Write a protein that binds this ligand. Structure first.
Ligand SMILES: [Zn+2]
Length: 57
């Protein structure tokens, strides 16, 4: 754990809320996995504290 590759200034942001700092917006992209919960999910990184969760589309 020494290098990294995160991005914020990029990725179109979407209007949402943050259950952590209470922000009112977050970044958003899709994240598909295998199959055992929700095919193709969208993570939303709040644009304030830097927290991200998942959607259902
Ligand atoms: Zn936040």
């Amino acid at each position: 754990g020494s290098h990294m590759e995160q991005d914020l200034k990029t990725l179109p942001t979407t209007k949402i809320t943050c259950p952590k700092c209470g922000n009112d917006t977050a970044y958003w992209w899709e994240m598909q996995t295998r199959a055992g919960d929700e095919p193709s999910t969208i993570f939303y990184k709040c644009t304030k504290c830097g927290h991200t969760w998942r959607s259902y589309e």
